[PDB]
């Protein structure tokens, strides 16, 4: 496999604040920024192992970048060039984040910093609430993404059968913003069966799991992003079978992938 990137992983490894690459950041300003409000770009300075995935995070209604900053560097450091994006306005809905994500994804290609970085053909998109909602609205309304992540995702739609990218759908237990039967399990329920996809319910979590550093969406991003973005099967070990994590209230998934 042409795309695996750093030494084979272990639970200390995929839960480190940060992983076996060293990262810079660059910023994206609002003027510099066509059709998002801007970001930053985390990356891996090692290049000696080729071209990296890329991934875009969105925020949710109301909220800044920084509400899921952390996770920039975070999964930058395990081998992604990853931006956190701000929206054109903090009252942007679903539909228009995931415009936001694709264009900040697009942005990376031509990105003076990192465009020699990335491979342009493995991209993948994660948010949190109605960034999470964009991000499979991204992935539905692009098919060759590799991967989507809606975290504690809020959507008016609740039909993703449109979605061809493999899907973790993570949901907070306790989540009264967006409650996980009315939107995270809706949301998995509705992607196709043959899709590669799961659901994680984090154990009584509040809706807001993902605005501060949280090892369970951590590490299952990561492996995530490995399995998919990277076509790295050494990373399924995470994910199939269903993990034994007391961190973990429901878990579903179309295992193997």
């Not at 496999?1 to 950041?25: K, L």
């Not at 920039?72 to 081998?79: E, L, M, V």
């Not at 993570?170 to 329920?189: M, W």
């Not at 492996?223 to 878990?251: G, H, M, T």
Request: one cysteine or more; hydrophobic letters at 35%; glycine letters at 8%.
């Amino acid at each position: 496999n042409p795309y695996e990137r750093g030494p084979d992983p272990t639970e200390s490894s995929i839960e480190a604040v940060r992983g076996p690459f060293a990262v810079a950041q660059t910023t994206v300003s609002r003027l510099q920024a066509d059709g998002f409000g801007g970001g930053t770009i985390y990356y891996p300075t090692d290049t000696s192992q080729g071209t990296f995935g890329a991934v875009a995070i969105s925020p949710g209604f109301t909220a800044g970048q920084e509400s899921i900053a952390w996770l920039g560097p975070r999964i930058a450091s395990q081998g992604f060039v990853v931006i956190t994006i701000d929206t054109i306005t903090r009252l942007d809905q679903p539909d228009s984040r995931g415009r936001q994500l694709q264009a900040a994804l697009d942005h990376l290609r031509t990105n003076s910093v990192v465009r020699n970085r990335i491979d342009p053909n493995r991209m993948a998109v994660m948010g949190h609430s109605m960034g999470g909602g964009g991000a499979l609205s991204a992935a539905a309304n692009n098919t060759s993404l590799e991967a989507a992540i809606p975290l504690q995702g809020w959507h008016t739609r609740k039909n993703w059968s449109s979605v061809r990218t493999p899907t973790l759908v993570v949901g907070a237990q306790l989540d009264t913003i967006a409650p996980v039967s009315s939107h995270s399990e809706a949301f998995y329920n509705s992607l196709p069966s043959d899709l590669d996809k799961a659901y994680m319910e984090l154990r009584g979590a509040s809706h807001f799991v993902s605005n501060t550093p949280d090892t369970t969406t951590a590490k299952y991003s990561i492996a995530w992003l490995k399995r998919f973005v990277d076509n790295d099967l050494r990373y399924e070990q995470f994910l199939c079978p269903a993990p034994d994590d007391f961190a973990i209230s429901e878990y579903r998934a179309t295992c193997p992938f």
